[PDB]
Design a protein around this ligand. Structure first.
Ligand SMILES: O=C(O)C1=CCCOc2ccccc21
Ligand SMILES: [Cl-]
Ligand SMILES: [Cl-]
Ligand SMILES: [Cl-]
Ligand SMILES: [Cl-]
Ligand SMILES: [Cl-]
Ligand SMILES: [Cl-]
Ligand SMILES: [Mg+2]
Length: 343
């Protein structure tokens, strides 16, 4: 049976939601969309409710809406954001126009530390990342503002199905670039899931020192900071930079050796230094993986190979499919009506 819906004026729009959701109030800066906090009377959770803005206005927007719903419906892991509910007030495909998504309300992020704290926080990021990567999903945007943390230090990874970041968003002295792997920052080559391990290394360093690792003022300044720490590329990696122009620019720089990480991260646990050296490798083929990193001695007090699960298979063949607006809309409607809530 369909629930009863009620209407309220929120975020310059009329919101129409099931009676179970009460005490709606706008929250956040708008970085993830148009979002309200609420109390869910069915589960007892404080929740975040997102109303999608013009979901089917173009082919690009319609496919992005379908992508967000597919990703959120798949993610079922303690250290990753999950979907509590999805709904529409429409009674048929013909009147379907708005989509609402519901998740747990998270109070703070990593921006808002003993060595034991660093162990637990990085362990949880890697546990969630092992799950994400087992489904052949690449996050691309791990950074402190995308990591929700509660009073008991428990952590969830955020940011799935939103618009790809623009060139302007990545320009200048901006946190949205400081965590990016060099091969994606400069479009050196076709990248893969190894980009996310670079980002984890940048996050871990910052928790240990209290300071951004590579706070570049622009793309080139940031590359210079990176190469000073990890060394200039050797002939093996240069061959793999398929961009002719990017390869030529790199060879204009004087060669530099990799620095001594024990003299950069002064006083840190030697096991933390060792792990950072294995994450912050310029050649992405040679970086440690999430599954390998969980078994590193730095995490000995938390690692349990019987409690680090992998994901069900995730079919993303739709990503290479060309459809019309109304076809993406119908696929999205089908995914709304088939949703089954978690236990
Ligand atoms: O990455 C996302 O899609 C979300 C992040 C948290 C804030 O907005 C959301 C609301 C509902 C479901 C998901 C999200
Ligand atoms: Cl209800
Ligand atoms: Cl609707
Ligand atoms: Cl951030
Ligand atoms: Cl992106
Ligand atoms: Cl030189
Ligand atoms: Cl699937
Ligand atoms: Mg993002």
């Amino acid at each position: 049976e369909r629930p009863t819906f009620y209407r309220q004026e929120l975020n310059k729009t009329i919101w129409e939601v099931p009676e179970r959701y009460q005490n709606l109030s706008p929250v956040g800066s708008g970085a993830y969309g148009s979002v309200c906090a609420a109390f869910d009377t069915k589960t007892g959770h404080r929740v975040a409710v997102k109303k999608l803005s013009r979901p089917f206005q173009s082919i690009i927007h319609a496919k992005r809406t379908y992508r967000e719903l597919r990703l959120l419906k798949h993610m079922k892991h303690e250290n990753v954001i999950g979907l509590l509910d999805v709904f529409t007030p429409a009674r048929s495909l013909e009147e379907f126009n708005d989509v609402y998504l519901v998740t747990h309300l998270m109070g703070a992020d990593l921006n808002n530390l003993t060595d034991d704290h660093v162990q637990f926080l990085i362990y949880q990021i890697l546990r969630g990342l092992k799950y994400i990567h087992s489904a052949d999903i690449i996050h691309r945007d791990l950074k402190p503002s995308n990591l929700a943390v509660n009073e008991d230090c428990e952590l969830k990874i955020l940011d799935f199905g939103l618009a790809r970041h623009t060139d302007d968003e990545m320009t200048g002295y901006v946190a949205t670039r400081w965590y990016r792997a060099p091969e994606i920052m400069l479009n050196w080559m076709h990248y893969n899931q190894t980009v996310d391990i670079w980002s984890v290394g940048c996050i871990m360093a910052e928790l240990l020192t209290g300071r951004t690792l590579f706070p570049g003022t622009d793309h080139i300044d940031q590359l210079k900071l990176i190469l000073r720490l990890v060394g200039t590329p050797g002939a093996e990696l240069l061959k793999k930079i398929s961009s002719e122009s990017a390869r030529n620019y790199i060879q204009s720089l004087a060669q530099m050796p990799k620095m001594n990480f024990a003299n950069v991260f002064i006083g840190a646990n030697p096991l933390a230094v060792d792990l950072l050296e294995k994450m912050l490798v310029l050649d992405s083929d040679k970086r440690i993986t999430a599954a390998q990193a969980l078994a590193h001695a730095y995490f000995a007090q938390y690692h349990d190979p019987d409690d680090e699960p992998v994901a069900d298979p995730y079919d993303q063949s739709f990503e290479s499919r060309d459809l019309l607006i109304d076809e993406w809309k119908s696929l999205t409607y089908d995914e709304v009506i088939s949703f089954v809530p978690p236990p």
